[PDB]
């Protein structure tokens, strides 16, 4: 019955970014927070320079009509100096600084010369190609805000300001555990209805890939002690505690009831397919998270609700879980009114060079497939019933938790 | 003059693939590539179980037609192993094993209770609801192929069969390094034609995101000698290295002169903007490349070149290159013929939810900016000119590296 967006929403509102912060060297820093403004501490460029190659003019000299001969040239690191005879142009070339007192500059190509006067033709405005000290980045300025995630696009300007570290937010900790008498562990055997646990080794892959400092506390027995203690320790060592299962999603069982007694936990019922469970509240001193059992419940949960929330705690200013875009179904698709589906598809280009989504097979959560052979989500809206080949269709492409990049 | 794609093949067709191997657990595999396939050591599922949550029946018994009894049940973890009398049935979870003789299994939302046991509102259908043993993986099966580079998505799946740990290829070696009397590190004044050094930051990161193990010389200094020990080493220590510039990729100066002792070297020229120059070569016992100074240059040059290399290197059979799609320029755009120009640009939604480049702004390389405001490349094809607005066009979505 509750929405996707109301429970999103529901869980954001009431966190409140971490502001605890530590300053590390900026190779440390990959998409990581950044804790307080970025300060230029040098005017970039440094001094006014030549936006192309070609000639430095005074504007006294240029419909005075007679050509100008180069007098002299400034280029990178070496500048000019030796006071500019008055009639003359000066070959000058980009990047290049420009001598004191110059008033526009003109591209060669534009101006065809000769061997003892160079003629311009377009009368040339004022200020015309000289980047000036500080265009791009001036010092006392704001080049980077509290909030912005670092990458490869960031980092790189700050080392070009001399900068070597800067303060960002702590790692968040996010504590794990699974729970239940079918979970059995790689190398056991498999007693009757039991399997090998692996919803907390996919919880814990994307934890890592995000960012995160995880605190695997295994499998808890069952035992309502074990389980009042792994609460306690979870709790007393992260900022999120995330059940890969076991613990209760709605279900009347002692695992409920530690979880009833221990906290302020609600337990919703989501309109989404696959899932719908979904258990979450505060702890003592934490979040917690309550995934469903079944594998593709809950890794879509995680994806959709708890990805995003660990984004808001980290002190991330951006809106973090990738864009849908629209594009045409080559495939049709079984949905149900009711609730909204997100099936599993692949973003293939046309013979057209198009976009448009396959599907992946049966989207049963009976199985993990989707996950490998998908590249995206098809989100089929909460009211549609089934959709035809060439229908129109919001699509999510995965991101690096699933492959690429 | 040569062509990006020439290049491309010219660089990979000779570029053998790794095939060291250490063997971890799942946890520690994220992005690592396999080394071997993975046989599915059980049939899975590995017994027959509901779809649904309700009570498994047989056909005789609902056939009869009154109600009738639930002599147990079968849960999660607790298998039913009762006696299972006629003229009744068992309660049964969802994914829980279906009992000995059960014939079909119906839905919670198929039945109403009654004084002396359950009722059946509609009709069953033989076998309908039994997920059944080995249906979805067979086991001596092959789950996953080596060189599957290995995600969230197929990590689980070998953990669904008890395996704890698999083989993959030994993490790519990439040795980084800068050079050049311009250079200062963080802290030190900036003399006269100086700068902070970047490229080699901008290639530590974008290396180490790619999951390859970075091994960072520093800047050597100025000195013929300096630099000798510094690739010998590198070599010596690694697959790859890469002169995150200083070292030369065309010009005549003593830098030149020790590539071209220490290994065949390539001064290739390409047909793109930014960038032109690049260095590339066999050394001794690894490949070099050599990034343009230039920061866009660099970067760019690195992301389209390396990084394709770094992953056919790596062991993994795709592609790992973004896939481009076609789109609409919302903006004008500048492009000289005679070169591919890799313009920098802004993906979004119009009003009608389809998707649209914009440009960043100035597509020159006297700045690092666009690669932050931007979300892609502009990919236009070498003998285009100026494409106007509403034209269609490549794009290529940037990755994880840029954000």
């Known amino acids: 019955l509750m929405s996707l967006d109301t429970a999103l929403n529901e869980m954001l509102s009431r966190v409140t970014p971490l502001t605890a912060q530590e300053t590390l060297p900026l190779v440390q820093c990959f998409g990581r927070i950044l804790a307080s403004d970025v300060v230029s501490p040098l005017d970039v460029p440094g001094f006014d320079n030549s936006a192309m190659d070609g000639y430095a003019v005074r504007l006294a000299d240029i419909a005075s009509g007679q050509p100008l001969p180069v007098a002299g040239k400034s280029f990178a690191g070496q500048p000019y100096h030796g006071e500019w005879p008055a009639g003359t142009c000066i070959r000058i070339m980009t990047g290049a600084p420009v001598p004191e007192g110059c008033e526009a500059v003109v591209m060669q190509e534009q101006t065809e010369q000769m061997d003892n006067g160079v003629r311009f033709t377009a009368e040339v405005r004022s200020g015309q190609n000289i980047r000036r000290r500080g265009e791009d980045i001036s010092a006392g300025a704001v080049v980077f805000p509290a909030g912005t995630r670092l990458t490869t696009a960031e980092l790189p300007v700050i080392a070009s300001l001399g900068i070597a570290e800067v303060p960002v937010i702590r790692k968040v900790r996010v504590a794990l555990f699974s729970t239940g008498d079918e979970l059995q562990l790689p190398g056991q055997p498999l007693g009757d209805g039991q399997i090998y646990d692996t919803n907390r080794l996919a919880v814990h892959l994307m934890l890592e890939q995000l960012g995160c400092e995880v605190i695997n506390l295994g499998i808890i027995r069952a035992d309502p002690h074990a389980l009042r203690a792994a609460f306690i320790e979870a709790d007393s060592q992260a900022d999120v505690v995330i059940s890969s299962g076991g613990v209760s999603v709605g279900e009347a069982d002692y695992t409920k009831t530690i979880l009833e007694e221990l906290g302020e936990i609600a337990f919703w019922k989501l309109a989404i397919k696959p899932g719908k469970p979904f258990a979450f509240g505060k702890l003592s001193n934490s979040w917690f998270c309550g995934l469903p059992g079944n594998p593709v419940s809950a890794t879509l949960t995680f994806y959709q609700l ?4 660990l984004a808001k705690l980290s002190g991330n200013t951006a809106s973090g879980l990738p864009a849908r875009q629209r594009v045409r179904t080559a495939s049709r698709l079984k949905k149900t009114p009711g609730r909204l589906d997100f099936q599993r598809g692949v973003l293939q280009r046309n013979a057209d060079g198009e976009l448009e989504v396959t599907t992946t097979g049966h989207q049963g959560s009976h199985i993990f497939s989707s996950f490998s052979l998908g590249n995206c989500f ?20 995965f991101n690096a938790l699933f492959g690429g990049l």
């Open 306 to 309: 708890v990805q995003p929330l």
């Open 378 to 397: 098809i989100v089929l809206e909460r009211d549609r019933g089934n959709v035809e080949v060439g229908e129109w269709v919001e699509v999510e492409p």
